[PDB]
Amino acid sequence: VKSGKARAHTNIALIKYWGKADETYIIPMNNSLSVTLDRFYTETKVTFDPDFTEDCLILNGNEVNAKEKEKIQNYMNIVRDLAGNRLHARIESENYVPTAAGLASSASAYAALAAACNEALSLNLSDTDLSRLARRGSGSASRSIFGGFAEWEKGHDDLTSYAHGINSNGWEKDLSMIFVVIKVSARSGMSLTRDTSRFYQYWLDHVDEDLNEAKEAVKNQDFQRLGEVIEANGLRMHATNLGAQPPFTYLVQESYDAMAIVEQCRKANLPCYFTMDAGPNVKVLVEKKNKQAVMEQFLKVFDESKIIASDIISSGVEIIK
Amino acid sequence: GSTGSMVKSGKARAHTNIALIKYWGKADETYIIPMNNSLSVTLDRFYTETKVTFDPDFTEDCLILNGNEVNAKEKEKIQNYMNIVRDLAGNRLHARIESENYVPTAAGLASSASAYAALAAACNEALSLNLSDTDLSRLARRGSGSASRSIFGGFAEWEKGHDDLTSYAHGINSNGWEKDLSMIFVVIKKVSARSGMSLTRDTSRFYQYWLDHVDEDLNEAKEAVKNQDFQRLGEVIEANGLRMHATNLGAQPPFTYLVQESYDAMAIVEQCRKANLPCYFTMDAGPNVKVLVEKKNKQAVMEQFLKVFDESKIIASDIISSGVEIIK
Ligand SMILES: O=C(O)C[C@@](O)(CF)CCOP(=O)(O)OP(=O)(O)O
Ligand SMILES: O=C(O)C[C@@](O)(CF)CCOP(=O)(O)OP(=O)(O)O
């Protein structure tokens, strides 16, 4: 019997990953830039037993649905292949996330699993190969191998497509992300758009410049500059969905109300910037020093229970005991 | 009806139009000069009838809308517009304006294009200004940009120009193609069009993108019309309409006119399209989805929407060939 346990934190893309060059190995049309969150994470124990017939997944104490179970059994086949064994595993996982708030991620799930399998089967995988392993489950999991700022380099094959951590001289310790809590999966949404969106080329033509400008801002620890490019990049992502055949949107009116509050804060000498993912939740990057002030502005309009802050964590994926 | 010797009245009926290539954002806010050309179709079903009566006794302009007094705000608005008319006609006469909107305004359809075209034409008739169509378009434009196109029937294009003299629309001869087409309206506090286009135009991060493709879209559409190629016209206009709404997403801060139900209707259009009912949608300053379809398939497409939308919510109109007309 072989076993290991790890904690992986979710991460939010500032420069978005959106569209796969390759659906089976999960290679992206473009690089992406994320920050890892202190507050939301997944803890996953994996246990390999010669007696097991088929992989079992218990999440938060309950069993998973067809699609996940299947999704997990295909992923574990990849693990088996890599390990060179034929062992099925009982997986017990726990999401540390505000309940039923749309904030559970494949990113934390798969990074945690990859690192737990790594530990269980003693593979001593390099961070690079761990990221690659996580990428095969969910693209954004590639980045949750790392803390702080991370970049997923798209590469062109299974070997070259992986994330790496970015040193910002501890800039991440100065930043925070406020969540405003407010259904098409990212996988399905993004493939429709990657395949059919009339505005997809426009996305591809600007993503690299945004990326470079984002990465440059990080080197200089220049918040306003980072803020503006990621905000624009973010909106361009949702634009591409408007061009889809047929169009769709992740956003609802409340999402826009939150956006408007972010703009006012800037006008009130409280710099912050928003982004949205595959849902209407609005995420607000802000400096720690201004975090409380910005939150107060939201509390005027949103319920206290819906305004949830998190720090950016510096460390990466972590084996547990 | 009967009019005293020293009173000049005129009454006109102008039809609403829907932009297939969108006007969105002004170069000049005071004279209403657009940042780009637009192209539209004039709808047979929806129109405004406006009567105007000039009387030397009248001390100020009066506006009666669908039988009721307008408030002081809209009153003040209409008096400033009529000043333009007075300046043009070289008089100082005031008028009583009796207008009736036969447009589903409560349902969200815009009345601004027909209202201002009707008013312009009505005045030209009352005062005998002998205005050319070009000059009628220019006068309607001062009131609302889209109004410049409602002077004309069928397909019409607003040439943007660079000043008050050069910015106006004309009718496009389509060899009668307008007679084969129809538009279906799926009916679903609004930022005004004027207000909305201004925020996007001034601040939108994606506005340049709009500007970089509008002329190409327009040429493709116009070439589509010359060819009477419904697919070619439909694809470019659908994309154009979507790009306009995209710009709004890039505004500071963003907004949208679309709701989930709008998206639902679009889905049904694409469905009809995959099922050999060719049609294409567009949206203006609100959630209503408008569906361009050939008159033959109108009935079929409607039924598909009727599978999910309330019968009262689905309303078709043909496209009318004639332009603004004076009436009794
Ligand atoms: O995370 C980002 O960069 C952007 C998004 O969050 C925005 F919605 C997408 C997440 O993608 P994911 O769930 O990883 O897709 P998968 O590869 O199909 O599993
Ligand atoms: O009609 C189109 O080209 C597209 C739109 O309808 C989309 F919302 C804009 C209409 O603008 P309008 O009411 O004419 O503005 P005004 O000049 O400020 O009065």
XYZ file of C-alpha atoms and ligand atoms in Angstrom:
687
model
C 0.000 0.000 0.000
C 1.372 3.383 -1.130
C 0.106 6.763 0.009
C 0.783 10.478 0.171
C -0.988 13.742 0.913
C -0.569 17.280 -0.419
C -2.139 20.745 -0.283
C -2.536 22.839 -3.442
C -3.961 26.403 -3.508
C -6.201 27.759 -6.266
C -4.788 30.440 -8.550
C -6.426 33.218 -10.546
C -5.242 34.050 -14.035
C -4.464 37.733 -14.615
C -3.482 37.059 -18.211
C -6.060 34.450 -19.189
C -5.693 30.936 -20.544
C -8.560 30.538 -22.977
C -8.567 28.047 -25.836
C -6.573 24.859 -26.421
C -4.171 24.325 -29.285
C -4.484 20.634 -28.338
C -7.442 19.166 -26.491
C -5.999 15.801 -25.492
C -2.729 16.934 -23.879
C -4.115 20.317 -22.816
C -1.685 22.638 -24.600
C -2.928 26.278 -24.676
C -3.211 28.690 -27.610
C -1.354 31.186 -25.440
C 0.718 31.768 -22.297
C -0.989 32.799 -19.078
C -0.073 34.618 -15.891
C -1.657 33.857 -12.537
C -1.367 34.583 -8.825
C -1.858 31.874 -6.175
C -4.308 32.421 -3.312
C -3.660 31.868 0.382
C -7.298 31.309 1.358
C -8.724 28.692 -0.999
C -7.162 25.262 -1.382
C -7.590 21.543 -1.778
C -6.126 18.789 0.398
C -5.925 15.393 -1.254
C -4.807 12.073 0.136
C -4.208 9.332 -2.379
C -3.855 5.655 -1.486
C -2.671 2.957 -3.923
C -3.855 -0.556 -3.045
C -3.109 -3.745 -4.996
C -6.674 -4.858 -4.105
C -8.514 -1.964 -5.732
C -10.506 -2.700 -8.893
C -11.076 0.851 -10.065
C -10.130 4.320 -8.864
C -12.352 5.720 -6.142
C -12.823 9.419 -5.415
C -14.378 10.787 -2.237
C -14.692 14.571 -2.193
C -15.711 16.435 0.949
C -16.983 13.102 2.221
C -19.165 12.247 -0.761
C -18.658 10.366 -4.032
C -18.284 12.160 -7.362
C -20.495 12.254 -10.471
C -20.142 10.105 -13.600
C -18.170 12.704 -15.576
C -15.710 13.398 -12.758
C -15.239 9.742 -11.810
C -14.580 9.018 -15.483
C -12.498 12.172 -15.690
C -10.491 10.938 -12.684
C -10.022 7.423 -14.016
C -8.557 8.675 -17.302
C -6.232 10.978 -15.387
C -5.048 8.156 -13.136
C -4.325 6.075 -16.231
C -1.845 8.819 -17.060
C -0.397 8.466 -13.594
C -0.134 4.695 -13.925
C 1.590 5.018 -17.309
C 4.070 7.493 -15.799
C 4.693 5.359 -12.711
C 4.892 2.122 -14.626
C 2.327 0.294 -12.527
C -1.263 -0.856 -12.709
C -2.448 0.235 -9.278
C -5.803 1.886 -8.733
C -6.085 4.446 -5.936
C -8.654 5.540 -3.388
C -8.602 9.324 -3.457
C -9.915 11.349 -0.539
C -10.041 15.067 -1.127
C -11.236 18.084 0.810
C -11.923 21.550 -0.692
C -11.275 24.503 1.615
C -13.603 26.967 0.007
C -16.722 28.955 0.992
C -19.539 26.497 0.372
C -21.646 26.731 -2.792
C -20.104 30.028 -3.902
C -18.843 28.937 -7.320
C -15.249 29.022 -6.101
C -14.106 25.422 -6.324
C -11.441 24.864 -8.953
C -9.881 22.205 -11.111
C -6.600 24.060 -10.483
C -6.268 23.175 -6.826
C -7.787 19.734 -7.344
C -5.321 18.559 -9.962
C -2.192 20.164 -8.606
C -2.938 18.568 -5.244
C -3.572 15.176 -6.852
C -0.458 15.330 -9.009
C 1.708 16.195 -6.026
C 0.017 13.534 -3.844
C 0.569 10.853 -6.433
C 4.102 12.118 -6.807
C 4.619 11.641 -3.079
C 2.705 8.380 -2.845
C 4.675 6.686 -5.640
C 7.974 8.407 -4.705
C 8.640 9.853 -8.182
C 10.616 12.878 -7.009
C 9.197 14.794 -9.966
C 10.804 18.159 -10.659
C 8.492 21.159 -10.299
C 8.486 21.248 -14.110
C 7.344 17.659 -14.502
C 4.859 18.103 -11.668
C 3.360 21.052 -13.518
C 3.266 18.951 -16.687
C 1.548 16.178 -14.768
C -1.007 18.606 -13.377
C -1.555 20.165 -16.818
C -2.955 16.875 -18.152
C -5.863 17.089 -15.704
C -6.683 20.782 -16.051
C -4.632 23.464 -17.763
C -4.816 25.914 -14.859
C -3.622 23.223 -12.437
C -0.239 23.535 -14.150
C 0.152 26.847 -12.337
C -0.976 25.779 -8.863
C 2.300 23.919 -8.453
C 3.655 27.387 -7.584
C 2.979 30.234 -5.187
C 2.906 33.964 -5.884
C 3.065 34.898 -9.551
C 3.283 32.023 -11.989
C 3.434 31.816 -15.776
C 2.261 28.863 -17.917
C 4.488 28.691 -21.013
C 2.416 27.218 -23.815
C 5.151 25.290 -25.620
C 4.106 22.965 -28.430
C 4.169 19.451 -26.987
C 3.575 17.466 -23.791
C 7.209 18.041 -22.890
C 7.353 21.808 -23.424
C 3.976 23.055 -22.104
C 4.392 23.875 -18.422
C 4.267 26.521 -15.695
C 7.029 28.126 -13.633
C 7.112 30.371 -10.564
C 8.115 34.016 -10.964
C 10.259 35.740 -8.355
C 8.989 39.264 -7.680
C 11.236 40.054 -4.721
C 8.287 39.349 -2.443
C 5.910 41.760 -4.143
C 3.196 39.153 -3.640
C 3.280 39.792 0.114
C 1.894 43.297 -0.609
C -1.133 42.159 -2.614
C -4.574 40.667 -2.024
C -7.635 39.614 -3.974
C -11.210 40.445 -2.971
C -13.891 38.064 -4.158
C -17.407 39.246 -4.877
C -19.676 36.240 -4.857
C -22.503 36.483 -7.346
C -23.625 26.918 -16.226
C -21.068 26.372 -19.011
C -17.743 24.804 -17.994
C -14.513 26.584 -18.811
C -13.487 23.563 -20.892
C -16.676 23.597 -23.009
C -17.071 27.353 -23.103
C -13.529 27.838 -24.261
C -13.545 25.257 -26.953
C -16.679 26.659 -28.579
C -15.018 30.089 -28.538
C -11.598 28.812 -29.631
C -13.281 26.989 -32.521
C -16.003 29.413 -33.624
C -15.578 32.882 -32.161
C -15.508 35.684 -34.687
C -13.373 37.712 -32.254
C -10.868 34.984 -31.368
C -8.147 36.228 -33.710
C -8.413 39.620 -32.033
C -7.698 37.887 -28.749
C -4.666 36.067 -30.193
C -3.280 39.267 -31.683
C -3.118 41.067 -28.313
C -2.441 38.355 -25.743
C 1.365 38.337 -26.103
C 1.717 42.102 -25.748
C -0.464 42.070 -22.623
C 1.593 39.234 -21.271
C 4.893 41.048 -21.834
C 3.501 44.256 -20.325
C 2.153 42.294 -17.370
C 5.501 40.596 -16.819
C 7.306 43.903 -17.105
C 5.064 45.542 -14.494
C 5.864 42.704 -12.115
C 9.616 43.283 -12.446
C 9.067 46.917 -11.456
C 6.418 46.104 -8.837
C 4.243 48.655 -10.623
C 0.677 48.004 -9.496
C -1.252 50.464 -11.695
C 0.549 49.219 -14.793
C -0.052 45.537 -14.011
C -3.620 46.388 -13.053
C -4.627 48.051 -16.315
C -3.283 45.437 -18.693
C -4.781 42.496 -16.791
C -8.108 44.275 -16.515
C -8.164 44.866 -20.283
C -6.951 41.325 -20.979
C -9.708 40.013 -18.796
C -12.454 41.839 -20.623
C -11.038 40.801 -23.997
C -11.490 37.178 -22.879
C -15.199 37.680 -22.278
C -15.412 39.605 -25.531
C -14.286 36.492 -27.372
C -17.320 34.665 -25.980
C -19.608 37.326 -27.379
C -18.207 36.439 -30.803
C -18.904 32.716 -30.371
C -21.267 30.799 -32.617
C -23.700 31.320 -30.985
C -22.679 33.975 -28.420
C -22.763 33.498 -24.677
C -21.598 35.336 -21.577
C -20.446 34.371 -18.100
C -21.396 37.814 -16.825
C -24.611 39.078 -15.221
C -25.736 42.590 -14.203
C -24.335 42.232 -10.689
C -20.916 41.429 -12.146
C -21.095 44.825 -13.865
C -22.156 46.576 -10.648
C -19.052 45.223 -8.921
C -16.973 46.400 -11.870
C -18.403 49.892 -11.542
C -17.412 49.991 -7.867
C -13.824 49.122 -8.788
C -13.739 52.088 -11.158
C -15.037 54.446 -8.469
C -12.419 53.279 -5.956
C -9.683 54.220 -8.451
C -11.312 57.618 -8.756
C -11.303 57.750 -4.964
C -7.558 57.224 -4.717
C -7.956 53.498 -3.982
C -6.219 51.637 -6.846
C -7.669 48.216 -7.709
C -8.543 46.140 -10.786
C -10.981 43.392 -11.613
C -11.090 40.120 -13.497
C -13.659 37.413 -14.074
C -13.325 33.752 -15.035
C -15.898 31.155 -16.109
C -18.635 32.674 -13.995
C -20.083 36.016 -12.842
C -17.960 36.223 -9.662
C -15.822 39.383 -9.779
C -12.303 39.200 -8.434
C -10.523 42.353 -7.400
C -6.777 42.694 -7.210
C -5.831 45.315 -4.634
C -2.842 46.257 -2.483
C -3.047 45.107 1.140
C -2.782 48.692 2.367
C -6.004 49.600 0.559
C -7.745 46.253 0.996
C -10.115 47.283 3.829
C -11.087 50.579 2.216
C -12.020 48.890 -1.043
C -13.995 46.232 0.797
C -15.993 48.912 2.626
C -16.968 50.422 -0.695
C -18.384 47.052 -1.765
C -20.232 46.527 1.545
C -22.307 49.573 0.697
C -23.792 47.542 -2.187
C -23.157 43.845 -1.514
C -23.915 41.622 1.490
C -21.011 41.194 3.890
C -21.276 37.425 3.384
C -20.528 37.898 -0.311
C -17.327 39.946 0.073
C -14.445 37.523 0.705
C -10.782 38.583 0.798
C -7.678 36.452 0.313
C -3.974 37.064 0.399
C -1.630 35.883 -2.326
C 0.416 32.988 -0.949
C 4.228 32.896 -1.508
C 4.854 29.151 -1.221
C 3.810 26.508 -3.740
C 2.242 23.077 -3.548
C 3.013 21.400 -0.251
C 3.204 17.812 0.878
C 1.343 17.143 4.069
C 3.142 15.142 6.761
C -59.027 69.340 -41.599
C -59.833 73.081 -41.671
C -57.118 75.703 -41.031
C -57.259 79.494 -40.552
C -55.681 81.769 -43.157
C -52.612 82.657 -41.065
C -51.715 79.157 -39.888
C -49.391 76.725 -41.666
C -49.714 73.054 -40.854
C -48.190 69.899 -42.218
C -48.340 66.282 -41.256
C -45.977 63.488 -42.056
C -45.576 59.775 -41.477
C -42.065 58.392 -41.128
C -41.119 54.756 -40.526
C -38.626 53.373 -38.020
C -35.365 51.881 -39.257
C -33.011 49.263 -37.848
C -29.250 49.520 -38.332
C -27.602 46.478 -39.911
C -24.264 48.244 -39.803
C -24.298 50.211 -36.530
C -23.895 53.898 -35.822
C -22.163 53.970 -32.465
C -20.259 56.935 -31.133
C -20.193 60.544 -32.370
C -17.377 62.604 -33.789
C -19.376 65.738 -32.964
C -21.895 65.617 -30.129
C -23.529 68.977 -30.783
C -24.263 68.560 -34.528
C -24.561 64.759 -34.328
C -21.809 63.726 -36.713
C -21.034 59.973 -36.372
C -17.636 58.299 -36.077
C -18.586 56.015 -38.994
C -21.154 55.297 -41.697
C -24.155 53.152 -41.021
C -26.569 51.091 -43.045
C -30.220 50.288 -42.228
C -33.544 48.893 -43.375
C -36.810 50.790 -42.986
C -39.637 48.825 -41.382
C -43.134 48.783 -42.816
C -44.989 48.060 -39.576
C -43.693 50.759 -37.202
C -43.864 54.484 -37.728
C -44.649 57.839 -36.226
C -47.225 60.330 -37.480
C -46.510 63.932 -36.596
C -48.554 67.019 -37.297
C -47.211 70.493 -36.880
C -49.191 73.724 -36.823
C -47.442 77.107 -36.938
C -49.411 80.067 -35.510
C -48.129 83.673 -35.107
C -50.255 83.836 -31.957
C -48.377 80.912 -30.412
C -45.931 82.130 -27.760
C -43.874 78.950 -27.454
C -43.744 75.449 -28.900
C -46.240 72.873 -27.649
C -45.768 69.080 -27.914
C -48.619 66.567 -27.623
C -47.595 62.920 -27.636
C -50.108 60.106 -28.104
C -52.801 62.431 -26.828
C -50.953 63.730 -23.774
C -48.878 66.756 -22.743
C -45.159 66.141 -22.452
C -43.310 67.344 -19.328
C -41.258 70.539 -19.092
C -37.997 68.673 -19.729
C -39.036 67.182 -23.054
C -40.850 70.470 -23.697
C -37.551 72.351 -23.290
C -35.841 69.746 -25.506
C -38.371 70.188 -28.311
C -38.199 73.957 -28.204
C -34.445 73.901 -28.801
C -34.934 71.616 -31.800
C -37.637 73.848 -33.282
C -35.208 76.761 -33.054
C -33.137 74.968 -35.653
C -36.223 74.827 -37.828
C -36.908 78.528 -37.236
C -33.344 79.403 -38.112
C -33.545 77.307 -41.276
C -36.905 78.661 -42.399
C -35.970 82.215 -41.453
C -38.993 82.876 -39.261
C -39.848 83.171 -35.596
C -43.061 81.141 -35.623
C -43.791 78.603 -32.897
C -45.750 75.442 -33.424
C -48.096 72.978 -31.821
C -46.767 69.472 -32.400
C -49.219 66.599 -32.240
C -47.372 63.303 -32.591
C -48.525 59.687 -32.438
C -45.963 56.912 -32.085
C -47.066 53.689 -33.745
C -43.963 51.918 -32.411
C -43.804 49.292 -29.598
C -42.061 51.730 -27.276
C -43.199 50.081 -24.043
C -41.833 46.865 -25.588
C -38.514 48.720 -25.899
C -38.402 49.558 -29.619
C -36.920 53.004 -30.289
C -39.091 55.838 -31.563
C -36.312 58.337 -32.028
C -35.619 57.686 -35.734
C -39.207 57.926 -36.958
C -40.098 60.725 -34.574
C -37.415 63.064 -35.818
C -37.846 62.180 -39.477
C -41.586 62.758 -39.149
C -41.050 66.131 -37.460
C -38.544 67.266 -40.092
C -40.732 66.270 -42.992
C -43.823 67.728 -41.300
C -42.145 71.089 -40.865
C -40.882 71.057 -44.437
C -44.449 70.544 -45.539
C -45.931 73.176 -43.197
C -43.496 75.939 -44.132
C -43.021 75.029 -47.782
C -39.246 74.849 -47.353
C -38.858 72.677 -50.460
C -36.042 70.812 -48.738
C -34.242 68.173 -50.785
C -34.198 64.664 -49.365
C -30.567 65.336 -48.518
C -31.525 68.399 -46.539
C -34.466 66.607 -44.859
C -31.992 63.940 -43.724
C -29.621 66.630 -42.404
C -32.469 68.282 -40.454
C -33.651 64.982 -38.953
C -30.020 64.209 -38.032
C -29.756 67.280 -35.792
C -32.501 65.681 -33.675
C -31.270 62.070 -33.614
C -28.601 60.371 -35.753
C -30.649 57.308 -36.706
C -33.417 59.702 -37.812
C -31.355 60.712 -40.833
C -32.040 57.313 -42.386
C -35.813 57.201 -41.801
C -36.312 59.723 -44.578
C -35.777 56.791 -46.929
C -37.349 53.385 -47.585
C -35.690 49.980 -48.078
C -31.907 50.026 -47.580
C -30.364 53.349 -46.603
C -26.865 54.541 -45.726
C -25.777 57.396 -43.532
C -22.628 58.893 -44.935
C -20.769 60.325 -41.979
C -19.198 63.347 -43.675
C -17.135 65.823 -41.662
C -19.628 68.602 -40.878
C -23.276 69.693 -40.747
C -23.451 70.030 -44.546
C -21.819 66.700 -45.400
C -23.349 64.364 -42.806
C -26.591 62.824 -44.087
C -28.117 59.612 -45.482
C -29.352 58.420 -48.868
C -31.543 55.582 -50.078
C -29.817 52.634 -51.754
C -31.557 51.140 -54.771
C -31.666 47.404 -54.144
C -33.475 46.365 -57.340
C -36.455 45.688 -55.099
C -34.667 43.187 -52.876
C -36.083 44.955 -49.807
C -39.404 43.451 -50.902
C -38.135 39.914 -50.235
C -36.948 40.629 -46.709
C -38.466 40.816 -43.241
C -37.392 41.384 -39.668
C -38.642 39.572 -36.618
C -38.595 41.249 -33.243
C -38.086 39.175 -30.140
C -39.210 41.340 -27.248
C -37.306 40.834 -24.018
C -33.461 51.376 -16.446
C -31.774 51.508 -19.910
C -28.632 53.524 -20.475
C -29.774 55.798 -23.236
C -28.238 55.122 -26.706
C -26.813 58.658 -26.816
C -25.384 58.335 -23.320
C -24.156 54.784 -23.825
C -22.427 55.384 -27.176
C -20.751 58.440 -25.663
C -19.201 56.531 -22.727
C -17.982 53.735 -25.010
C -16.780 56.144 -27.688
C -14.876 58.224 -25.155
C -13.481 55.481 -22.933
C -13.804 52.034 -24.436
C -10.660 50.019 -24.606
C -12.070 48.167 -27.603
C -13.356 51.148 -29.528
C -10.365 51.351 -31.913
C -11.026 47.704 -32.766
C -14.557 48.704 -33.798
C -13.202 51.544 -35.915
C -10.684 49.254 -37.646
C -13.382 46.954 -39.059
C -16.433 49.064 -39.631
C -15.586 50.188 -43.187
C -14.774 46.628 -44.303
C -18.046 45.390 -42.821
C -19.901 48.182 -44.603
C -18.331 47.447 -48.000
C -19.030 43.744 -47.576
C -22.632 44.481 -46.698
C -23.106 46.917 -49.604
C -21.567 44.404 -51.984
C -23.891 41.818 -50.457
C -26.834 44.036 -51.274
C -25.779 44.710 -54.890
C -25.647 40.915 -55.267
C -28.844 40.174 -53.349
C -26.832 37.597 -51.409
C -28.689 37.036 -48.127
C -26.056 34.796 -46.545
C -23.231 37.223 -47.273
C -25.201 40.181 -45.929
C -26.418 38.255 -42.906
C -23.025 37.072 -41.743
C -21.282 40.413 -41.879
C -24.164 42.269 -40.244
C -24.453 39.745 -37.447
C -20.753 40.121 -36.761
C -20.931 43.884 -36.941
C -23.756 44.025 -34.437
C -21.858 41.769 -32.082
C -18.714 43.901 -32.367
C -20.694 47.007 -31.380
C -21.813 45.336 -28.181
C -18.249 44.194 -27.624
C -17.152 47.816 -27.497
C -19.494 48.357 -24.572
C -17.725 45.631 -22.669
C -14.469 47.579 -23.068
C -15.930 50.837 -21.663
C -14.777 52.472 -18.428
C -16.499 50.923 -16.535
C -18.068 48.214 -18.713
C -21.713 47.640 -19.446
C -23.959 45.543 -21.653
C -27.466 45.845 -23.120
C -27.897 42.094 -23.418
C -29.540 39.711 -20.960
C -29.577 35.915 -20.796
C -32.819 35.798 -22.789
C -31.182 37.777 -25.617
C -28.578 35.050 -25.778
C -31.359 32.490 -25.757
C -32.891 34.049 -28.877
C -29.538 34.137 -30.663
C -29.204 30.411 -30.026
C -32.526 29.840 -31.735
C -31.376 31.831 -34.758
C -28.249 29.709 -35.123
C -30.447 26.623 -34.708
C -32.748 27.745 -37.514
C -29.675 28.425 -39.564
C -28.323 24.886 -39.110
C -31.794 23.660 -40.011
C -31.886 25.498 -43.346
C -33.895 28.470 -42.137
C -31.338 31.191 -42.986
C -31.601 34.203 -40.644
C -29.468 36.675 -38.691
C -29.814 38.708 -35.518
C -28.804 42.169 -34.339
C -29.377 44.169 -31.158
C -29.521 47.893 -30.470
C -29.521 49.804 -27.147
C -31.331 47.116 -25.184
C -32.029 43.374 -24.879
C -34.472 43.013 -27.760
C -33.137 40.719 -30.458
C -34.013 41.559 -34.042
C -33.967 38.828 -36.665
C -33.365 39.532 -40.337
C -34.908 36.810 -42.510
C -36.179 36.389 -46.079
C -39.942 36.928 -46.258
C -40.589 33.326 -47.294
C -38.897 31.886 -44.172
C -40.432 34.483 -41.866
C -43.299 32.221 -40.861
C -41.058 29.229 -40.275
C -38.534 31.130 -38.149
C -41.285 32.699 -36.087
C -42.716 29.304 -35.207
C -39.316 28.276 -33.807
C -39.214 31.301 -31.541
C -42.836 30.513 -30.639
C -41.623 27.200 -29.239
C -40.183 29.159 -26.316
C -41.279 32.783 -26.454
C -44.734 34.100 -25.645
C -46.778 34.771 -28.787
C -47.157 38.408 -27.764
C -43.376 38.708 -27.572
C -42.787 37.824 -31.210
C -43.626 40.434 -33.838
C -42.654 40.591 -37.492
C -42.500 43.509 -39.893
C -41.856 43.703 -43.613
C -39.455 46.228 -45.091
C -41.147 49.105 -46.869
C -39.963 50.456 -50.215
C -41.106 54.049 -49.937
C -39.752 56.905 -47.878
C -41.213 59.481 -45.556
C -44.651 60.589 -46.662
C -46.950 63.508 -45.973
C -50.481 62.611 -44.944
C -53.789 64.144 -43.862
O -7.535 29.725 -15.494
C -7.433 30.486 -16.504
O -6.286 30.760 -16.971
C -8.673 31.050 -17.148
C -10.013 30.431 -16.758
O -10.166 30.213 -15.385
C -11.091 31.353 -17.149
F -12.322 30.820 -17.164
C -10.204 29.125 -17.454
C -9.870 27.837 -16.718
O -9.492 26.739 -17.466
P -9.525 25.244 -16.925
O -10.625 25.003 -15.921
O -8.165 24.981 -16.345
O -9.727 24.424 -18.234
P -9.258 22.982 -18.515
O -7.846 23.084 -19.000
O -10.109 22.502 -19.670
O -9.390 22.033 -17.317
O -29.211 53.130 -35.028
C -28.002 52.720 -34.977
O -27.184 53.015 -35.890
C -27.543 51.891 -33.806
C -28.131 52.258 -32.453
O -29.520 52.255 -32.469
C -27.717 51.264 -31.429
F -28.166 51.397 -30.164
C -27.746 53.639 -32.082
C -28.834 54.692 -32.241
O -28.508 55.964 -31.841
P -29.485 57.203 -31.727
O -30.719 57.008 -30.866
O -29.855 57.636 -33.130
O -28.524 58.221 -31.026
P -28.588 59.759 -31.106
O -27.896 60.300 -32.337
O -27.870 60.246 -29.867
O -30.040 60.172 -31.090
